[PDB]
């Protein structure tokens, strides 16, 4: 019913595991888990996926929406913000 992406954005210095996509599944993941058990259950699933290595980031967060109220994205643009923001490579 709802779509919805976060164009990421990340930098080429690196030759060796990309922390990029382990930080949507930690986060995609972390907060999954979130609403489960903060909430018990809801209703809002997440997933991403890699735009070439040498250009953008391509987030996909596939979610019902109904009873989130826009409050779940606010873990997810300051993931990938704070990831291009000061640096945490």
Known sequence: TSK???????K?????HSK???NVIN????????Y???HF????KISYDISTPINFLCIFIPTL?????MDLLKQALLILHN??????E
């Open 4 to 10: 919805q992406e976060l164009i990421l954005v990340l």
């Open 41 to 44: 259950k809801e209703f809002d």
């Open 65 to 69: 929406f109904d009873m989130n109220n």
């Open 83 to 88: 990831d291009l923001h000061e640096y945490v």
């Open 12 to 16: 080429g210095e690196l030759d060796l």
């Open 27 to 34: 986060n995609a993941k972390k907060n999954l888990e979130k």
């Open 20 to 22: 990029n996509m382990k």
């Open 36 to 38: 489960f058990k903060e």
